[PDB]
Design a protein around this ligand. Sequence first.
Ligand SMILES: Nc1ncnc2c1ncn2[C@@H]1O[C@H](COP(=O)(O)OP(=O)(O)OP(=O)(O)O)[C@@H](O)[C@H]1O
Ligand SMILES: Nc1ncnc2c1ncn2[C@@H]1O[C@H](COP(=O)(O)OP(=O)(O)OP(=O)(O)O)[C@@H](O)[C@H]1O
Ligand SMILES: [Mg+2]
Ligand SMILES: [Mg+2]
Lengths: 202, 203, 62, 241, 219, 219
Amino acid sequence: GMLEARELLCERDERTLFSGLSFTLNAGEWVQITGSNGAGKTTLLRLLTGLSRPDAGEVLWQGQPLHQVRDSYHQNLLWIGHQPGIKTRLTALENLHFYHRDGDTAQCLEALAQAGLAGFEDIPVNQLSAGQQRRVALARLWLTRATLWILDQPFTAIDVNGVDRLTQRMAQHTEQGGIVILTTHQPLNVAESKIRRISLTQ
Amino acid sequence: MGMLEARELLCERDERTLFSGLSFTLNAGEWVQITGSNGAGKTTLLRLLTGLSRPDAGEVLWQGQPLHQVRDSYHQNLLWIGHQPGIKTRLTALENLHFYHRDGDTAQCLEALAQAGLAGFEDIPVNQLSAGQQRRVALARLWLTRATLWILDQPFTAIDVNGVDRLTQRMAQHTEQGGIVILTTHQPLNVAESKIRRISLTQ
Amino acid sequence: TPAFASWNEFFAMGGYAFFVWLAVVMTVIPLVVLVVHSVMQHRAILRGVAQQRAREARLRAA
Amino acid sequence: KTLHQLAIPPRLYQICGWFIPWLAIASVVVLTVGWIWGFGFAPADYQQGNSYRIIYLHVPAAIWSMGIYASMAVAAFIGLVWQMKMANLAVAAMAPIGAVFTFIALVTGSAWGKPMWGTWWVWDARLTSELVLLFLYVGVIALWHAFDDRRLAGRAAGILVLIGVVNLPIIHYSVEWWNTLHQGSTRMQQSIDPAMRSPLRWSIFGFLLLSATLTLMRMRNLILLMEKRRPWVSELILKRG
Amino acid sequence: MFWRIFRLELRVAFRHSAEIANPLWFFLIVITLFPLSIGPEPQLLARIAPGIIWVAALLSSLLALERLFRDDLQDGSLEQLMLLPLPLPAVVLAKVMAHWMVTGLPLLILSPLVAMLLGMDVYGWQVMALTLLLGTPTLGFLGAPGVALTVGLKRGGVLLSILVLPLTIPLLIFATAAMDAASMHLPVDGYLAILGALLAGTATLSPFATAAALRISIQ
Amino acid sequence: MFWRIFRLELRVAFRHSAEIANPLWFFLIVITLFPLSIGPEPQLLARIAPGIIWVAALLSSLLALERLFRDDLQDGSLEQLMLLPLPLPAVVLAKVMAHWMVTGLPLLILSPLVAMLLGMDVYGWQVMALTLLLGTPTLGFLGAPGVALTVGLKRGGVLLSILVLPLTIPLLIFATAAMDAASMHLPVDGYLAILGALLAGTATLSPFATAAALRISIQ
Ligand SMILES: Nc1ncnc2c1ncn2[C@@H]1O[C@H](COP(=O)(O)OP(=O)(O)OP(=O)(O)O)[C@@H](O)[C@H]1O
Ligand SMILES: Nc1ncnc2c1ncn2[C@@H]1O[C@H](COP(=O)(O)OP(=O)(O)OP(=O)(O)O)[C@@H](O)[C@H]1O
Ligand SMILES: [Mg+2]
Ligand SMILES: [Mg+2]
């Protein structure tokens, strides 16, 4: 049904990272791509979002390839990479207001308050520290209604309280049919039965 | 006496005092880890300790002298790692490490890159290197330098567990000899509480 | 058979010799450079991978 | 058939290595025959004098410069419609050959216009057009050499070549329009003679064959360079070693 | 989401007011420099003005063209801009329209002082303003694919100029011919129609290939 | 560390075996841009050569001037360059001297080709080469203080762009006047001595002030 893989071969730069991965996702999942430093767990996620063209094999979304279903795929997804994805020139409020809704107080100032950024709405971006620069893009995640969450390294420059603050929301999304694909290095405070582990096969 | 003494630091940024009157003297061979919260000054303390930022109040003392005349001796014994790696991405790893001292021949090059986990990744450009490997290139500097004072903001970020273990081992070998490492990370590093020293932010 | 009977006169290209011979040398030399360099590159890249593989075998033995 | 297995690069290397020497011998013998017959056993022009025979040294290369840009299109466009790297390497194979041919055309035109204009370079028709073609080849060279990767470099060079090929006739007509007004020029390009017009065609064929030789052997160069690790290169160097 | 993208790009261009003044002062430095360097004789100024003005406009838009896609990849906002629920060519069209509105429209606003700095007439000023209006969107559309090719590169120098300027040569020739023929009080309606046809062709072709080159440079 | 930084900046500037030709081809692009608008007559181009060559030099210098300091902020290597065991003014002098090698040495190399293209004489070519050798480092040394303040400023202003490109007035005016006075056979050493004194003043005053500006910009 949901994001599925078929014979994903992504050998490039005169080397091979992985071969023949055909993992499927159904409704209400939680996967973590496992590997080492320099094993290719971001190229896989970029190919999952459709940023990079696959060398061999295809990703499918309700049984259709990603190059014609792109409207619904982009409607029902958000992607947070290593780059923050926000403008450094503006302040936090309109950088958040770029993404969907926000605006009135029904989803404004408390999506930022829940990310630990209460009282920091009209302040420009680089007048905050890289951790809360990441927390702006993570406070985007509290006001979106996208079914497919893809997060590369969300626990980057994030406090010990911010890990639990993220993970509670992550699990709450996992209850109501939320498919999430995260790449991370810090261990989670989640039992292994809840989280699937799509390992990159060699 | 300690050769790094931070005296009466006051930092006011947009009607907020990050820290006022913070003072600590660092004796030889120890392991300060600056703690804090997201939105607290645990960078503008390391950055101010390096001399990049001028203090609003208080000052930094190196070997009994302030930081505005002993710069030539202070920059010779310091190694700073920031959030940004500080490496030219268009080159490969070899000349990026050869910018800094030693490297070159195989006595100090091709094995400091190998100890960081980048074996076979020396002549590849940093543009096609992974972000973890991009930071590993900058963090491979610890294995070839002779700098006594290391100041590393977030060293163990985007780095797998074996990399953190090797980095903590190398940092322990530097700590046993004469040398002070000041880091700031969020995850608890797998070391005993007895040797690490926590200088917390006060408000 | 040529319009210039004398061999010295053939090199004195009807009073316009220097322009024609400059054009001839500055056409001949670029093609010579384009061939010699691009075949020296072939030899050096084949020899480059050969002496790369020799060092790779030496390090595999080591 | 043979076209699908032409995509496998060891087979392409073997086919190109078979194709190089006979076609190179044919190229050099046709070029020698044309040059000898033209610069020797042939008359000259009444008006231009005895520098007239620079019509040889200019006219094939120049038109084939335009021609090889057309070849660029039937590489790059196909390399952007079946997404094939084997076609995208032909752009970087044919780029500096076209640049050298266009520089030779500019040099021969500037040297041939000297008995008339008095100055080495005057701002006339078709020489500005060749200079703009040289700039387009320079852009292809710089865009290929600037990228660190090879596949991205090939696709970017294909995009640039398609854009330049689309924009080329507009430039070709606008530079001609720049010569309709702003005074004029003499007909120094292709003023031919009835007893002269045959080794011109032979030298056109010879320069085409030489361009084919150069692009085939540079395609061999780029094929050997791009795949540094794949074991068909190991088999080839074991045959050599 | 279309006009939200346009308003956001205008806001982020006005927040970066600094790279907006260097091409404007470059147009000013060329327009000031050429007659004072050459001389105050008005016989040759009336012929040299269409050339100097439009080459200054070409190089000023070249100078401004670097901020169009360089800052977006480093902040990573382009990887999200491709992921909004509307096609990437329309995002390209909105961003290049904001590029024209933030920098090319100050050229039209300042062309009063440019015309009065070097002579001209009322009809000459009218052809000046109309040619700049018809040609600066053409220049932006023509220079968009070169910037879309040079995104992942860190080269911020002569490469974009080499890629762009031979493509914008015929726009330069036609616009200079239009202004020169207007300086002799001859009707230039056909030349303006040629410039409008060039604008329509660039509007048809440039956003369909700039997005493709941008997708090439991001993988 | 001095010559190592110089070789490093050369290594970043020229990345491949055949990459030095790009500043040479951009120059010929500008020198083919100007007669393509103004006209094909060697007489007018001989009259207006100073503005053409110096606008090409200005555009090259200001186009390559961003990569001095804007690249090093987002990379982050400028902080560790400041932490290098060597004074900041000599580091800045190495960087801007390498930048001059990116731009000024192409000027001096392509000087006879552009002297042959836009019609001039041997005395004009000699005057052009001498004043370009004496003026391109001045152009870099006056342009770098503005960029040093510009890239390290959030709040910023249009008023910060006043420090960089408006500062170009005296050198360009004096050099174009010297070329125009040397177009006719007149003595020219009186302005050449002024340009040499300007080079001495810029070489004395640029890195010392620009190092302080670089200390101000990042905090
Ligand atoms: N587009 C690409 N396609 C294939 N391989 C690539 C590509 N870009 C870089 N590589 C190579 O593959 C590895 C990069 O893969 P990738 O960056 O996805 O790993 P990674 O998971 O990001 O590493 P980390 O987990 O530390 O982030 C590097 O060894 C690099 O040389
Ligand atoms: N130069 C500055 N730039 C931006 N913000 C600053 C600066 N100086 C002080 N601040 C403010 O001071 C606070 C602390 O800044 P700092 O960057 O030191 O936090 P940090 O310790 O780096 O946070 P993190 O743990 O995420 O790195 C921030 O909330 C920020 O708003
Ligand atoms: Mg990654
Ligand atoms: Mg920090």
